[PDB]
């Protein structure tokens, strides 16, 4: 059925947009020292998984949740900082800059691929309506 | 919640003492660390300086 392709590709587009948004947020806040609660900015990551509940193996993509990374927060020595711990260490984000740049580019590419899939399926469905004049 | 913006703020200033040059002037005065001179501000208020 070509109609379900609309839902599949729309889900893919939304998920990749969310992934690119997460990557952009990580890139922007790579040097943030604090948040509103005084906690360091932890790198965010989306969780991709299929959505084929009505008895299928393939159904597209959906973002289950956004999770903060468990890699070690970078400790910088600064004793004058109000946020420094007992040893004088301040926690800083664990953002991987090269990783987030590659994530941005890859998300853009797969987003574009899904755009092309949607356009092709729309063209095919348009051509179908002229079956036998 | 995927969008996290960033804003640039200035959390106070740096109070590390600076360089001290020796000008043979009896009026030039330097203060010990964490010490401030007191002046009368423009708006009739009280201001502290180094």
């Amino acid at each position: 059925a070509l109609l379900n392709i609309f839902d599949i590709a729309g889900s893919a587009l939304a998920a990749q947009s969310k992934r690119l948004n997460v990557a952009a947020s990580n890139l922007a806040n790579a040097d943030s020292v604090t948040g509103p609660d005084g906690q360091p900015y932890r790198a965010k990551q989306v969780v991709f998984q299929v959505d084929a509940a009505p008895g299928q193996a393939t159904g597209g993509v959906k973002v289950a949740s956004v999770i903060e990374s468990q890699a070690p927060e970078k400790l910088v020595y600064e004793p004058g900082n109000p946020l420094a711990d007992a040893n004088g260490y301040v926690k800083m984000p664990n953002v991987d800059v090269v990783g987030e740049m590659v994530n941005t580019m890859s998300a853009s590419r797969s987003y574009q691929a899904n755009i092309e899939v949607l356009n092709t399926v729309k063209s095919m469905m348009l051509k179908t309506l002229t079956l036998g004049q | 919640a995927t969008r996290t913006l960033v804003t640039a703020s200035t959390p106070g200033a740096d109070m590390t003492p600076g360089q001290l040059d020796y000008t043979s002037r009896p009026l030039d005065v330097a203060l010990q660390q964490d010490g401030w001179l007191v002046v009368q501000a423009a708006d009739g208020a009280e201001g502290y300086t180094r």
Binding site: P36, D37 | T7
Partner: peptide, 21 residues
Amino acid sequence: GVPGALSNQPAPPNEAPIATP
């Protein structure tokens, strides 16, 4: 509240505070 669905109630207004107070 599944994203992309339709709900009778309007979405709550989002807020981005710089300080908790």
